[PDB]
């Protein structure tokens, strides 16, 4: 995969959004370290600019969201424990910066 820029869709349970994923699943990736950069994350800025009730942002097929699960993490740096997700948590000002989109 490679850092890329996509147009995300929103989910919520405004009607530009779709209903939420019925089976959100978080897949960890063994080993696997990714660099996150808060200062150059074009997902995150389009996200908060677009912003009960939560709104999730989601990737179309061909892209995936990596999530940082590290306990050190503050938006920028190597992340040692990473997950791939199809959508963010429900957002109700990051973070938020624990996410980046990549292309498969």
């Amino acid at each position: 995969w490679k850092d890329a820029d996509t147009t995300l869709f929103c989910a919520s349970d405004t009607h530009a959004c779709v209903p939420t994923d019925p089976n959100p699943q978080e897949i960890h990736l063994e080993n696997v370290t990714e660099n996150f950069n808060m200062w150059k994350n074009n997902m995150v800025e389009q996200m908060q600019e677009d912003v009960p009730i939560p709104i999730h942002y989601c990737t179309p097929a061909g892209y995936v969201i990596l999530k940082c699960n590290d306990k050190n993490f503050n938006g920028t740096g190597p992340c040692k424990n990473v997950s791939s997700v199809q959508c963010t948590h429900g957002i109700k000002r990051s973070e938020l910066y624990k996410y980046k989109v990549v292309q498969i």
Partner: antibody
């Protein structure tokens, strides 16, 4: 209510190309999937294909794939369908629909539909 | 190439009915099922998504489920407003298509 209005010729000659247009909400075209679906009079539904509003992601019904092209014109908020070499079997009401797809979960459905347009194929 | 539904389902007003939808493990077996309600001459509308979830405006007289490679739509308190053609649908993860069912006309017996 997401308003979708399909357009095109009511009548097309056999072996010509059918072209249809679906007009969409601006604040949504780029950030959703959109499908075409058809229904010959008195018969059932058939999914034609879908296309993400920005991708880079198009999926066609495998049986119509050779004849089908879908396009998104974000500027004029048009979702379009071209279908080549039409026959008597392509007479149908054609619908555009906003599509919800979470590929990793296996859910794919149509939550807002336009009103449909009849295309009759006759020489 | 369609998921199999009965052509006709009917009952007197106020009765309960069910509509079956059978397919195979590459569709209903592995994917979520949706149901659509169509008055002839009008577009379908979404009735059920994610197998058993109702969109706004759909009453709880309508419920969906699935078992193995068959799905089912149960309707209680049958009434005039429910008379329509009903279609199930589901993604096929092997063929990569949305496959619709063959359609069922629901009649309230008058």
């Amino acid at each position: 209510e997401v308003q979708l209005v399909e357009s095109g010729p009511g009548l097309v000659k056999p072996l010509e190309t059918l072209s249809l247009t679906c007009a969409v909400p601006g604040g949504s075209i780029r950030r959703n999937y959109w499908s075409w679906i058809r229904q010959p009079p008195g018969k059932g539904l058939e999914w034609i294909g879908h296309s993400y509003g920005s991708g880079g992601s198009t999926n066609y019904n495998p049986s119509l794939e050779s004849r089908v092209t879908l396009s998104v014109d974000t500027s004029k908020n048009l979702f379009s369908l071209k279908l080549t070499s039409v026959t008597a079997a392509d007479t149908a009401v054609y619908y555009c629909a906003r599509t919800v797809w979470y590929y990793t979960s296996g859910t794919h459905y149509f939550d807002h539909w336009g009103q449909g347009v009849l295309v009759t194929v006759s020489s | 190439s369609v998921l199999t539904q009965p052509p006709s389902v009917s009952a007197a007003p106020g009765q309960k009915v069910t509509i079956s939808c059978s397919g195979s493990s590459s569709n209903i077996g592995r994917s979520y099922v949706s149901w659509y309600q169509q008055v002839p001459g009008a577009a379908p509308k979404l009735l059920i998504y994610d197998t058993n979830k109702r969109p706004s405006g759909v009453s709880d007289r309508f419920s969906g489920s699935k078992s193995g490679s068959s799905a089912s739509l149960a309707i209680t308190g049958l009434q005039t407003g429910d008379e329509a053609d009903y279609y199930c649908g589901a993604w096929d993860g092997s063929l990569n298509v949305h496959i619709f069912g063959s359609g069922t006309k629901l009649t309230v017996l008058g």
